[PDB]
Every structure is written in C-alpha cells, then in structure tokens.
Ligand binder design. Structure first.
Ligand SMILES: Nc1ncnc2c1ncn2[C@@H]1O[C@H](COP(=O)(O)OP(=O)(O)O)[C@@H](O)[C@H]1O
Ligand SMILES: Nc1ncnc2c1ncn2[C@@H]1O[C@H](COP(=O)(O)OP(=O)(O)O)[C@@H](O)[C@H]1O
Ligand SMILES: Nc1ncnc2c1ncn2[C@@H]1O[C@H](COP(=O)(O)OP(=O)(O)O)[C@@H](O)[C@H]1O
Ligand SMILES: Nc1ncnc2c1ncn2[C@@H]1O[C@H](COP(=O)(O)OP(=O)(O)O)[C@@H](O)[C@H]1O
Lengths: 439, 71, 438, 71, 443, 449
C-alpha cells in the first residue's frame, strides 16, 4: 500500500504482560530494554488511568538504544483511543508564531474531548422535485431499497433551488441542521450526458433506509476547538496552518466550557501524551515555559528523548546533562536505555529481516550480527536491504555472506567514514576553508 | 455563543456599549473626518496592463480587471 | 543543444551484473562509487523501502554531483528526482522544517492514466434543452457532431463568450473548454470588427488520446491547502492576498494520504516514491538534521541522497560541535555512506577527451596533454574550462581544431584561483593606491 | 500618469456623447499570445496545455479532501 | 535628454577587432587593459554563440582599474540581442524573499524566450466616422480611411464601434488598429485637418498621412525571460508583480513545469531560447550560503554565463570567520576563471582623461591636461576625472572658454583627494570621533 | 518663526566671483568649504552631471550640516533637496537598498504640463440602463447610465460607461447636484448642490454652489511638479483607475514595496516621452545623506551601482569620524567610516574647527537671531565657552540666560544671567566628572554602570 516499510514498522506494541507489567525478552517486535520497557509500561498505565496530569518522563540513552522505538511501542500499545502528539523539537521554531504558542498548541493537541452523538441524516437519489405556487412542494427520493415522497417547506424549496438539485442527484439532508448537501449524481446517469462539468462526480446509490440514526463517537483536540474559535471559519486553519498567536482569553473561555461539558456529562476529557523527540533542541525559553505548562490540570503526560551527554543548553553558554536545565530536570524522571548485547542484536536483525521480507542465511545473520557489534545496529540493519538487492542482482535465492560482504565493501559505516575523512583531510574542505584540488 | 458584545447592545444603560466605541467616537469628535486633507499623492496611475494582440486577452482583461461579480 | 557541466553523464555505466565498466556512460573511474549508486537505484526502483538515507562523501571535484545526476537518469523521467541545495531551505515564508516537508513530498510521485475526449469544432448549433441541459452542435471540415451538455459544462461554455460560428475546444471528461476564436467563414460578417477569425478545424471533430499524467503529493497538498489559480482572483491584490506558503499541518497531509490511497485501491492512481537529493548538506543546520531524523521515520519518506565535501567541520547552528562531513554523528549513523576518491592523471586525460567531444571541441594530442597537465597540477574543473575559450581562439585564427598555441593563450587570458591568489599576494602587499582592498 | 482619449473638437462633438472608459497605463507590457493565450499560462486549459484540464479536475475535485464524498 | 553624463557614458563597446579579437590600443572609448579586453571578448563570443552554459568569470583587480568599464563594454557590445542582467550583490538581501530565491530570480531573468508572431495592422488617416448611436448605442457605423496611396470604407461591427467611441476617434486622426485585438492607437493628427482640432492647444503636433497600403502583416519578435513566465504563472495578475515587486518565493514546481514547456516550445520550433548574461558587481558582498547555491545553479542547462567583479584581496568571507582570496570560498573559485585588470600608465590616464573631457563638454588646454595627468598618477584616475567637471565650473565662473591650469589648481585646492583626506583625518584625530567614541570639542 | 539650530543660515555668502565673504549670509569662516560648496551648487544647477559624490568631512560641530542646508537655499525651491540620515535606511518593510533607490529618485524632479479634460455641470437627469445577464449568479448589471449635465452656457446628455457610473455612484451623486468628471481618470467629484432650491431647511448641511460658468465640456491645462519616485509609487500601487484593482487598492492598508528595476526603467521611457513631447522639464536635484557613517557596507556597495546609473542625483555625504570600523564590516577600518574603494569616488570638502574670534562672531549672530539682546561682557563670557567647551554649549546657553534675565526683570542679558545659566545647565564634561566622582564606588546612591 501507501505505507512503505519504515524503521519502526516492526514495532507493534510495548510487549509486556498486561497483568504484572513484566516485560518478556522479546514480543511485539521489541527486544531487550526490559527495565526501560517496564518503566514505559508503568508510564502507559498512568496515561491510561489519566488522573495524573502533567508528569514529564525523559528517555535518556546513547544512539540506537531504542528510545524512539519504545516511544513508538508506547503509542501502539496506547492505541488510537488516546491522543499521542509526536513533536520534533525543531518544529517549535516556527516563523508564523512564537515558540511558547507552538508549545501551547502541542500541549492542547494532546487533550481529547470525547462526545457521543446520534443524529438523523436522510440520504438518497432524487427521483423528482414537484413544486406548487398559488409555497409548497414534494420530494421523491429512492435508495436501492426504498422510495418515498416527502413534503418540503418553503425554505427547503429555496435551498433546493440555491443548490441546483436535479433528478438523478444524490443528496444528503441533515435533519438536525436542516441543511442540504449534494454528494454527486447516481452512476446510473453516467449515460445521461455526453459532456460533464469539472465539479461533477458519480456515486453508487445510497442503500438501506432513507433516514438513518447512527450513533457516533467524536474525539476532538482542545487545539481543534481553539483553532475553530480562532476566527469565523477557523476550521480551515486546521489544515493550512494559517493561524496566529491565539489570544489567551479564547482558551480561557474554552477551558471553562469544556469543564461545564464534563460536569454536565456532555463530554469525557481524554488526556493523552505529548512526545517531544530530541528535546535537547529546545532552548532555555522553551524549558522555562514548559515548567508552568506542566503544572496545570489540562497538561498531558509529556515523554521526551535525548541522546546528549553533558552538553551546552541552547540559548545559553553553560553546559548541563542531557543538554537540559537542571531547573527543568528537577521536574523530570529519567528512563535510561542501554546498549544491546550481541544476542539482542541477533534478534533485532532477524525481526528487521522479517519485516523487510529478507531471507538471511544463518551465516549471513551471524556475520551481520558481528557488523552490528563492530559498526552499530543501524548500519547492520541498513545492510539487510542492501544485501537483498545485491543478491537479487545475482538472482540468488537467499542472502549469503558474500552479499553482506559486498554490501559492507560498498557502503562505509560511520567509523570507517570518519577514518576516510581524517585520511584525506587536505582533499576536503577544512573548518578553515583550506583545500587543495591538485593531484 | 458567549460574548459581551451581544449583551452590551441590548442593555439600556449603554455603558459597555460606549466603552467599546471610544475609538470611533473620538476620531469623529476630533473632526478628523471633516478637516481638510493636508496631503495627497502627487502622481496617480491606473494599473499596468498586458497588451496582447488577441481577443481572448481582451475578454480576460474585462473578466478580471473589471470583474462583474466583485463589482 | 547546450552543453552544461554534466551533460556528458548519460548514466552509471553498470554491467548487467551491476559491476561498473571502467569507462562507460561518460564516467571514468569512481567504479566502487558507481556500483554503490547502482544499488541505490535498485533500492529506489524496488519502491519497497521508505526513508533510507545515503551520503556521498569526498573532495570537491570528485564527481559527487555527476553520480547523483547519473542516478536521476538511471531512474528515468517516471520516478521523481527532486534536487535542492541545503541552502535553499532558509525560506523567509515558513520554518525550514516545513520547507523540508514540502521537498520530501515533491520526491513522491502519483501517476494517473487519463483518457481525454476532445471535441474541437465550429459551433453550428446551441440549443438550450431545459428551463438545465444544453445541446451543442460542433462541426469540422470532416463532419458535424451533436453533444448533450450538463448544466455545469454548459455554464462553462456560457462563461466563456461562445456563440454560434465560434470555434471552441472542449475536453469531454475534464469539463475544460476554450474559445479558439471566430470561424473565418464569418470573416466578412463586417468589414471591421474587434474579433479574431480562425480557420475551421480541418481534422476530426472528435479525438481520443491517452495522457499519462504525473502529479506529486506536494501538488495535492498545495491544491488542498488553499484555493488555487482561477479560484482565487483577489490574489491579484498582492500583500495579504498573494499565495503565501503556510506551515501545512500534518492533519492535512495525513488526510491527503487517506484520499490518495483510496484512488490507489480503485486502481486509478499509481504511487511512485522517488528521490530527494540535497547537495551541500553541510549547509543544513542542527535543527534540520534533527527534523530529518524524525521525518525519515515516516512510512512515505523518499530515499534521501546527501552530498558533502567537508572534512571535520563545525555543524551549522552548533559551533560547539565539530563532526565529519559537517553532519552530526547522531544523524550520520542513519546514512549509507559512499566515498568518492580523487582521479588519477590518466583518468583526467580521459575525462578531458569525453568533454571535448561533448562541447564539439577537437584537439591535437599535444593539446590533450597540455590540458590534462593543468588538470593534474591545478584542478580538473579548471582544465575543462580551458576547452571552450581555446576553441574560440582557434576559430578566430581560422583553425579547425584547438592546438597547444590556443590553450597556451587561453591559460594566460583565464587564470585559475591559485595564480590569482599569487597576484593578490604580490600586489595587495600594502594598502597603497593600486592595492587590493584587504 | 496614464493615457486617455483627448477630445479633439468641442464644436463637432454635439449634445449627446458616449463617455467610454479610456484610461490606460503608459507602462505597457507586450506579451506574445503563445505565452499569454496559447498555453504559457499553466492554469489555462486548451490545446497544447494538456495538463491543466486533468489537473484542475483531479486536484480540485476527485483527489480533493473537501469534496463531500471525501469528507 | 533624460540620460545625463555619467561615469561610464563614454563606453560605446569593448573596442576589439571583431575579425580577430585583437584589442585595438584604443577604440570605442576603452583605453589599454588590452589582455583583459581580449579575454572579455572571448567571453562575449561564447555568450553570443550560446552553446556553452553556466560558465562563471571573475574580473579581479584594484579599484578604478576598469572592471565595471569592461562589464559595461560587454553590455554595450551585446545590445538587445541578448539578455543582460546587472546585479549588485547587495540587492539579494531582500525582506520579501530569501537570498537564494532572489538569486534564483536573477538567473531566471538572464534566459530569454524568443517568440516571433504576426498580426494584420490597419493604419491610416480617418476620412470619416459615421456612427448612428440609435436609447442604446453602437448600432451601426461606417469608417473611411486613406493612406497617400489608397482609400477604403468599412462597415464596423458593434464592438469595434465601442472601440472607436472609446478612443474618441475623429476625422483627421491617424490611427493604427490591431485587428485581432481591436485596440486603436491614435498615432497623431493629420496636418491637413489641423483647423478641425479646435479644442487642441497650440502645443499640439501634427503628422503627414501614412503611406502605402492600409493593411499589412507586421511581425513582432518578442523576447520574454524565464523569470517573467514564472512570475506570470504565480497569481491571477502575476505580471503585475514584475513591476511593484511583491513576488513571494515562487514555488519550485511552477518553475519545473515551465522548464518542461519551454523545452517543448523549442522542440516544436515555436520558440527559441536565448541565453544571456548575469553580471554580479562586487560579488564578495555575497555570503557563504549564496556561493553554495550558485555552485549548483551554474550546473543547470538553463544557466546564463555569470560575470563577476571583486575589489577584494585575501579577505574575510561573509557569514563565516575565515579568509580566502577575493573573499570568495575556494570551492566556488574552483568553478571560476579569472581576468585581471592592471593599473594604468600615465599616458593611459592622459587618454582616459581626454576621453572624459570629450564626453563632458570641456576644453582642456594642453598644460591643464598634463597637470590632470600628473594628479591622476598621484591621486588616482577617479579624482582627476572629478577635477575635470570642477575646473569647467570654475572656468565658467571666471567666464573662460577653456580650462586653464589656474582652474585645475583651484579644483585641487578646494577638493581633497583620498590620501590628503586621510592625512587630514590622521592630523585631526582629536576633533574627529575615534573608534573609541572619544572626541574633544574644545579649541 | 520658531528658532532652530540653523535659522541664521541664509546661503553660502559667496561673491559673484565665487569667493567667500568672510562673514556673510549667516556664516563665519569655513570660507574654503563654502567656496567648495559653491562649485557644488554650480555642478547641480548645470543639469549636465549625474551621480557625482561629495563628502563634507570634519569633526562634530564644524558646520557640515549648516553647509548642506545652505546649499539647499542657494538651489532655491525649484530644485529637489532630499535630506536623510544614514539611520533612515533600515526599513522594516523593504530592503535598505530599496530605500536608497526611493531617495535617489525622490531627488530627481519633473515639472510637467498636464491637460485635464473634464465635464462639469448641474446633474439635470440621471437614468440608468441595464441588461439581464446570462446566469452568472450575480444577477442583472447596469449596461450604461444616461446623465444630463447643465452649465451656464450649455448642456449635454452623457451616455456613461458603467465604470464611470460606479464613480458617480460611490460619489453619492443625485439629480440636482453639481459634479465634476475627469475623462482622464474616469473619476468623479460631487462639488455640491445647485444654488437653485438652496432652501435652508436641510439637516444635510449641504454646500450649495453656483452653476458652473462656461460650457459643460472643458479642457484646462495645469503644470504639475512631481518626482520620479512619485511616478514609481503611482504605478506600483495603482489607484487612479475605476477598475477593481484600483478600487480595492484604496481599501487595503498602504505598504511600501520593493519596486523593480524593470518598472523604474520603463518609467524612464515614459518620462522621456514627456520630454520629447515638450510637456516636461527634467530638473535633477541633490540627495544629502547626513551621518553617512551610519550606512553599512551593503549600502555603500549598492551606491557604487546606483551612482553609475545614467541618471542619478548628486549625493552629498557628511561624516564626523576618524579612522573607524566600517559598519557591517568589523574586519575593515577606514577614514571617515567610508569604505576605501567608495571614498575614491568622492570629492572631499574638509571642514575645520573655528577660531575664538569666529566663535564670538557666531555667538553674536546667534544671539540676535534668537532676539537675545546681549551685552558685550556677556558675549565675551559666552565666547569663553566654545573655546573651553563645545561651540554648541555656547549657543544653548543663550535661551536659559534670556529667561533668567527676563525673570530678573532685566531687558538684556548680563554676565550674571549666564553665570547662573552655566550652573543650572551643565556641559557633558562637568556631568562626566559628577559621574566619575559619585560613581567612584557602588552603593545605594551610585550611578548604574
Ligand atoms: N529493542 C528493540 N527491538 C527492536 N528494534 C529496535 C529496538 N531498539 C531499536 N530498534 C530499532 O533500531 C533502530 C534504531 O533505534 P531508535 O530507537 O530509532 O534509535 P534511537 O536510540 O536513536 O532512538 C530503529 O529501526 C528501531 O526500530
Ligand atoms: N567520474 C567522472 N567521469 C567523467 N566526468 C566527471 C567524473 N567526475 C566528475 N566529472 C565531471 O567533472 C565535473 C566536476 O565534478 P563534480 O561532480 O562537479 O564534483 P563535486 O560535485 O564532487 O564537487 C563534473 O561537472 C563532471 O562534468
Ligand atoms: N580602460 C578604460 N578606458 C576608458 N575608461 C576607463 C577605463 N578604465 C576605467 N575607466 C573609467 O574610469 C572610471 C573608473 O573605472 P571603473 O571601471 O569604475 O573601475 P572599477 O569598476 O574597477 O572601480 C570609470 O568611469 C570608467 O569608465
Ligand atoms: N561658519 C558658521 N557660521 C555660523 N554658524 C555656524 C557655522 N558653523 C556652524 N554653525 C552653527 O553651529 C551649530 C553647530 O553646527 P553643525 O552644522 O550642527 O555642525 P555639525 O553638523 O558638523 O555637527 C549650528 O547651529 C550651526 O548653524
């Protein structure tokens, strides 16, 4: 389909016993990281129970230690039912709005408002419109399964006139609003005309009863209600962006009304998760805002990931662990992800090969595990796709060691690349611009 | 559904109604709407036009630059 | 046709087995790097995989951009190849992470095979059928045809000022129509009128032709983000009203992916993921690589090829961090890295000969020798730039071919940066009246 | 800063006269009809511009998320 | 006219033997710089030949060594046949668009699409207009037109009668009508009808009648740049932004479509592509992001030749903190051949001053020209050239017909050269505000 | 009427021979600089030259700006004098090189004859005529208006195009109004009601105006002064048509735009037609860039190309700085704060400090300019400042001393009133001593560093 195979496609959940939260050595695509997965499962429990507002959890560890994979597994195991905003810290440096607005919006995205509704919608093919003046009229609609005649009021005949409803059109009438919509024309009329206008499309005739009373559940972000109230047709801004630094007094009204809906039982508030990847790319002004943002009843749980050691915070010149302010880190609990043993690498490379539908020979998987130990998980992972293609070029049935070896010959790992950069430094643009182009 | 603007227009003591029109009232009370203009542009021009030796261009000029529905 | 820098590069020149031929498709050498690019071509054409990164790494003038344009020609015109420089993303309209998103989606193609039914003829009749439907009669030199028109295509015909005797073009399926003009059978309806008279169409009034249309996912973004073209006339005001880029929400792009997959399931559209190539990736900053890191994890992302010629260099936006290629080591782990090496003197000779015959220049053997000497001692790019001036100089000496005389003149009219730096060092010795500005 | 039609004679004008809008720019952008009419405008469908007719239908309706069937 | 006398007004071309590219010792207003003028003529040849795309040439040399003069000489010797864009590198730092977008538009401006078209134009003196205007208008009417060689009468269609009334077309008016558009341009008033134009003021001009046939096909060769096609396609009056500015960043997929369509018009033979020149004056004002873009913009098939000038030595590249020759990064300089301009000898200064004394209406006595030459050696070509204008104004104050040594001496005394200006600064350091902000105002 | 820093400057005070009179037109001294500024005035009045540069070079308070404002008076009112500081160039709307070009073209003037071709009368009939369009959805449209205009010696019936009716309609014209119509622009003005039926009992506060004398149709001619920049702005933001773009362009917020070279070049063609038609005189003027050291190296590098333009004003720079760092080019130091390759383009008029007797003369010129009648011992007192203190500090004391004298009931300022002015109003140096002595240590009562 349109979903291609990605880096985290094999991650299908968080892989824990739902009773004890004890992880198992592999399941749902994840391997190892047992304590981090158990901690992630404990966070997922308080996400799903929802009463604990505004906790912050940092996933800290070296590159290629499953910090993003665990965040994906937590999102998969949380399901579609609960909001899971996934934000790269780079996304907050908007030109169209301030960083604190951009953080506010991401916070607002992560709280759902859930509403359940039944409403009467009449949908069908128009058979005839009949009109009398002396205003009244009659409408004949069919499904595949019914035909009926409806009396139309004066305003309803006007709406039909304004919207140019013909016979053979498919129309919907929401009885709750009274508004007509034209969905198209019935495909039976495909021969009715030789040429058709640009805005015309054919449909199958509606099926079953003419007017239906489906029960539907709706979950909308607080961010959506904001942007809808931002301006007269603000819902269009939900797609184009095209929204300002929304006034705080609008959000003040919306929070007050959403509380009324929860008191009256019109809605259920569904607090979800914000995951900020590479949170060390935020600056001192983001972090100091997030402190106050977390300390509110409508704050989600915030997960975040960093691979930085002791490193300078952005927007300042002093260093700190993870690249984060200690004033901020005091509000955080930290999950640490470790490197992988060769046996855990061997499993992950098998899971990747299965997800990529690559049949490794046992020796190739062994050699590929050595490369994963010597050159890193991502490099050995990327050699799987490469060796499959090289094997296909020789029409091989299985990826042999010779296909991994040629993959290793053709594509350098980071360490071998850094060595190449050091070995050829005069042929390459230095940090001071010097280079020699000659032989 | 919840906006003071609607209520202030129905209350008989127009207090908040006047507090919301301060700017438009005093602008008018200063006579700036009646005071002579102290400047105007020294030159004025109509829009630049495409010139194309075709009839479709002349129609499309009339459709856009003299757009009937906007007009 | 014109001869740009790479116009001799026809492809990767790989064997059936994918091994590189030592000189083929206008490459010389880089065999190991051409073979590696061959596997990248296979990766793309398989269209199985999202978001694999590739890095081309090596000195300036080692052919990193030849290789990327060879890939583009191994893929052919079908597969979208989207080239940018890493400096192009610093837009003033929107955050640079939005500019990256727009370029990722330009690299994913969507192909629709549309049958166009065209009726072009003189309007012989216009008979409003209902009081909705129109009937229109169209005539060519080869017969006339009646058409039943939906009220929508009728009002399009009527919004254009079509009348009997006009010549019109109609697309039956799309609903597009154009007034081609007035038929010159009416050219003497007056002696002067402000009217354009055209011959009657002399072919068939009806034509059917099949056009394989290509769009991209970014085209679908732009069309869905805002009214486009004739939908938005007030755009003519500029200022607030002009079609500015806006920071598209991933709500929109996710909802576009839904609709696009619907038409793939109907079999109407074919998805074609392609390539985003970023040259001078060292011009990307730490925030861009931080975004690329996430964006490459999305299920749709194209294959990304990067080029860099930096050694160990500071990454932009974080001068505290020095890394190889100028690429953060965090992100470098994600990339398949292809090294490109410098050329031998004998390889420089062969490239000179390849480009000579591509510019249409022809050389004596000693003329090849002297140019190749400048390639070894100065720069490959310099010696190739000698070829065209030397041809002009030979031409104005009446000679059919460039010789040593014409290169020895070209090399003195047109200095390299090295001898020019020597002039700057000798002449800008002081801030005197005839000195260079420091 | 523009062109207009001057009245050349008052005596020969008469009492009933048609006032056309004659105002035009003196800056005057000459374009060939190949560009301005015959398909150098990418959005204008016709012969030659075979893309615009397809692209208008598919991007604004068929594959457009706001069409009621998609919504 | 509206062109005044300016620093380059004497440059009429490159001054090179077109048969051989041998520079003549002086011609067309250029003096010396022979090797540089020969090189610029070789560039000029391959510009006209078009077959070579995206080469870049730097003209490097000390200030006042004729770098702009040679650039202006190439522009004057290309003329209208080829697009010629001049860019000061300061210009791309727009607030409307990113500098790579501004730099893209400059490349797009430098490729011409040449389109040849015909129309029937009808031109002549109006003998009569009859229009009935029969409550409504434009019902029917007849037009009589003559040349010196023919007379004809025409029944007018109603939308032509609107055009005639819109242009207030009158007996004796000389008009052209483009038939397919139907626009009427009043080329003038015929002299024989002058007395009928009782409303026209005495300042009014008159013309003789048009000659030959009333109707002929006139063929126009348009050249339109790729940038103009890009901007036209941006919005519903996109061309209107070619004047006001207020183009945004034009979307890349619009440009990519246009490149394909222009390749179709070339293959169809409907249009020709005419590669021009982009001249980037003082290119060292660009920064490292710009040069990285240029490196690959030059590799496009639709790239002009780019010509550049730099005053700079080994100097700090903008947007970074290291130095390189010309202030240009070495990776960019690898893509560029360099033409050097040298300082002038005293006789070449004498000739340039003589040329400048011809371009302004100045008579120099032989001793005044010798003194200005001596001042030229000592104080620079530009300063002595500004003493020419000053001396003529002093001579005119004393009502002299020729500029004498006395006038040049007054000029040298009244207006300081750069070195004496620096010496004045180096003496006045307590009265002039220093780099420390310190200054003493006391006597 | 109000008195300002340069109110005493009236001109350069030169002889007909172009030598400076040692005290004339308000100046004292600077004679060589005043003579050089005279030759610059000659360069400007002789239209022949474009893009010559002049630098007034000299320390603060040496009269550089007085010289520039004296040039502005010797040129008179006809020639455009366009003063700016280098700090005006940093716009938030458009690139700083746009502002330079706008100022370059504001410094070139045009005087042009214009024929206004108009209809004027009492509206005596107004009758619209309209068509039922095909179904465009906006309904019926007025096809034309028939309007009757009555003047004192004629009447017309006009069949207007509907774009002129929109002018008539948006001008809220009625039957019985007096109106003016331009056939140039299609624009309309409601002049008033007729003086017929001018009954007092309208709340409408009408201006009743007499019937236009003469014929309904008129063809008056007037002479307009405009700059080239006025034409650029008119054509970049069109507003004189009755089309929809001109209409909406009056409702949108006004904003500056980076007017292209393409527009400016084509306006040169348009203006040269006016010259060849004999309806315009080109009158090039001067751009005075005060504080030119506040320009940056991008401004200066643009000025290279801008001055090479085949039309450009004369540019007069002023700078007060020694060897100083070039702004935007912290690597580069040069004299005057001007890039060394730009300084080559200019003629430098060095400007020198005043002598003590010149200061005495300036103090007396300035005192009588402000109307401060001032005793000779008081003049000597004020003129001992200017030597020991800046010259500006002298001139600034004259107004406080006048107030204090008048408050003391004196008709004229004595030494006492200056000695009080010296105490209430310190110079910078005495205040700088107060800082260094009080801020000699930190604390509650210290000055903040
Ligand atoms: N425990 C695991 N089980 C299976 N796959 C994993 C595991 N940890 C990491 N991976 C995979 O290895 C790659 C790198 O891990 P990732 O978490 O994305 O890196 P980082 O540690 O920088 O977040 C991804 O493709 C991820 O799916
Ligand atoms: N292997 C090769 N064979 C033939 N020509 C080459 C080869 N490599 C480079 N060239 C030519 O030399 C030029 C310089 O190489 P280029 O790819 O621009 O270097 P880089 O992009 O790495 O700086 C190219 O434009 C191309 O025309
Ligand atoms: N070889 C030459 N022949 C004629 N005029 C010249 C020559 N070289 C310079 N000039 C003139 O002298 C002035 C300064 O030269 P210019 O080309 O501006 O030098 P640069 O641009 O290098 O500062 C210009 O007015 C130019 O026309
Ligand atoms: N030669 C002079 N004659 C008369 N007044 C002068 C003279 N020079 C300067 N002034 C006056 O002294 C004051 C300061 O001079 P000013 O022009 O401001 O110096 P600058 O502009 O160089 O700082 C102004 O009021 C000016 O009119």
């Amino acid at each position: 389909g349109l979903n291609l195979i990605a880096a985290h496609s094999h991650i299908r959940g968080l892989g824990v016993d739902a009773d004890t939260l004890e992880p198992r050595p592999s399941s749902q695509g994840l391997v190892g990281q047992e304590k981090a997965r158990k901690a992630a499962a404990v966070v997922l429990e308080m996400i799903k129970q929802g009463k604990i507002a505004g906790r912050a959890v940092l996933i800290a560890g070296p590159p290629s230690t499953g910090k993003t994979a665990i965040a994906m597994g937590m999102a998969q195991s949380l399901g579609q039912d609960v909001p899971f905003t996934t934000l790269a810290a780079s996304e907050i440096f908007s030109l169209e709005m301030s960083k604190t607005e951009a953080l506010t919006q991401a916070f607002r995205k992560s709280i759902g408002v859930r509403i359940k509704e039944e409403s009467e919608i009449m949908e069908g093919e128009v058979v005839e419109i009949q009109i009398d003046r002396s205003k009244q009229g009659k409408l004949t609609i069919k499904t595949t399964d019914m035909e009926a005649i409806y009396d139309m009021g004066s305003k309803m005949i006007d709406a039909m006139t304004k919207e140019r409803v013909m016979a053979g059109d498919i129309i919907s009438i929401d009885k709750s609003s009274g508004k007509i919509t034209k969905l198209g024309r019935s495909y039976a009329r495909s021969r009715d005309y030789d040429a058709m206008g640009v805005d015309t499309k054919f449909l199958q005739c509606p099926e079953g009863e003419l007017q239906k009373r489906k029960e539907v559940v709706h979950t909308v972000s607080l961010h959506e209600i904001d942007v809808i109230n931002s301006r007269t047709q603000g819902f269009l801004a939900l797609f184009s962006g095209d929204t300002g630094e929304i006034r705080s007094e609008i959000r003040d009204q919306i929070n007050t009304k959403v509380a009324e809906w929860k008191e009256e039982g019109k809605a259920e508030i569904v607090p979800g998760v914000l995951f900020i990847d590479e949170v060390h790319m935020l600056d001192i002004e983001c972090f100091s805002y997030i402190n106050r943002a977390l300390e509110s009843d409508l704050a989600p749980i915030v997960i975040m990931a960093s691979n930085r050691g002791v490193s300078r915070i952005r927007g300042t010149d002093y260093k700190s662990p993870h690249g984060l302010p200690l004033d901020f880190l005091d509000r955080v609990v930290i999950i640490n992800t470790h490197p992988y043993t060769p046996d855990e690498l061997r499993q992950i490379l098998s899971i990747r090969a299965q997800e990529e539908e690559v049949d490794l020979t046992p020796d190739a998987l062994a050699l590929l595990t050595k490369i994963g130990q010597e050159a890193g998980l991502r490099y050995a992972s990327n050699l799987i796709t490469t060796s499959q293609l090289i094997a296909a070029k020789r029409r091989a049935k299985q990826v042999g060691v010779e296909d991994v070896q040629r993959s290793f010959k053709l594509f350098y790992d980071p360490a071998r690349s850094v060595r190449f950069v050091q070995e050829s430094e005069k042929r390459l643009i230095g940090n001071d611009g010097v280079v020699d182009f000659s032989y | 559904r919840e906006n003071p603007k609607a209520v202030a227009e129905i209350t008989t003591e127009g207090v908040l109604r006047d507090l919301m029109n301060i700017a438009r009232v005093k602008y008018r009370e200063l006579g700036l709407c009646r005071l002579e203009k102290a400047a105007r542009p020294r030159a004025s021009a109509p829009p630049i036009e495409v010139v194309c030796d075709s009839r479709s261009a002349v129609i499309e000029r009339e459709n856009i630059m003299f757009h009937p529905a906007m007009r | 046709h014109r001869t740009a820098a790479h116009t001799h590069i026809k492809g990767l020149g790989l064997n059936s087995s994918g091994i590189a031929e030592k000189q083929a498709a206008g490459f010389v050498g880089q065999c190991a790097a051409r073979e590696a690019c061959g596997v990248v071509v296979d990766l793309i054409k398989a269209h199985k995989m999202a978001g694999r990164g590739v890095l081309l790494a090596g000195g300036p003038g080692t052919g990193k951009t030849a290789l990327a344009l060879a890939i583009s020609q191994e893929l052919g015109t079908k597969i979208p190849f989207c080239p940018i420089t890493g400096s192009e993303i610093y837009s003033t309209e929107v955050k640079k992470t939005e500019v990256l998103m727009e370029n990722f989606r330009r690299a994913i193609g969507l192909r629709v095979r549309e049958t166009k039914d065209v009726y072009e003829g003189e309007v012989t009749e216009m008979t409003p059928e209902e009081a909705s439907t129109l009937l229109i009669g169209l005539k060519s030199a080869r017969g006339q045809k009646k058409l039943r028109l939906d009220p929508s295509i009728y009002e399009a015909i009527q919004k254009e000022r079509v009348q009997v005797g006009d010549v019109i073009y109609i697309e039956t399926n799309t609903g597009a129509c154009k007034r081609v003009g007035r038929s010159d059978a009416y050219a003497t309806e007056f002696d002067l009128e402000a009217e354009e008279y055209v011959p009657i169409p002399k072919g068939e009034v009806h034509k059917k032709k099949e056009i394989v249309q290509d769009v991209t996912l970014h085209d679908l973004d732009v069309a869905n983000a805002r009214p486009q073209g004739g939908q938005d006339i007030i755009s003519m005001m500029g200022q607030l009203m002009k079609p500015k880029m806006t920071e598209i929400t991933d709500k929109l792009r996710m909802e576009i992916n839904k609709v696009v997959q619907k038409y793939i399931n109907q079999g109407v559209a074919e998805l074609i993921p392609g390539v985003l190539f970023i040259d001078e990736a060292h011009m990307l900053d730490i925030e861009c690589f931080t975004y690329l890191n996430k964006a490459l994890e999305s299920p749709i992302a194209p294959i990304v090829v990067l080029a860099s010629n930096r050694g160990i260099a500071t990454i932009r936006g974080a001068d505290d961090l020095k890394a190889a290629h100028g690429i953060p080591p965090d992100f470098l782990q994600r990339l398949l890295i292809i090294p490109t090496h410098p050329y031998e003197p004998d390889e420089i000779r062969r490239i000179v000969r390849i480009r000579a015959q591509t510019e249409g220049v022809q050389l004596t053997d000693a003329a090849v020798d002297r140019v190749a000497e400048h390639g070894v001692r100065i720069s490959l790019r310099y010696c190739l730039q000698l070829l065209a001036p030397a041809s002009i100089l030979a031409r104005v000496n009446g000679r059919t071919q460039v010789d040593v005389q014409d290169i020895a003149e070209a090399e003195e009219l047109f200095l390299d940066a090295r001898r020019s730096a020597n002039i700057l060092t000798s002449t800008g010795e002081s801030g005197g009246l005839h000195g260079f500005i420091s | 800063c523009g062109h207009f039609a001057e009245t050349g004679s008052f005596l020969r004008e008469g009492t009933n006269v048609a006032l056309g809008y004659s105002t035009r720019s003196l800056v005057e952008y000459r374009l060939p009809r190949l560009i301005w009419c015959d398909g150098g405008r990418l959005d204008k469908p016709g012969p030659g511009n075979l893309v615009a007719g397809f692209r208008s239908k598919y991007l604004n309706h068929m594959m457009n998320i706001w069409t009621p069937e998609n919504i």
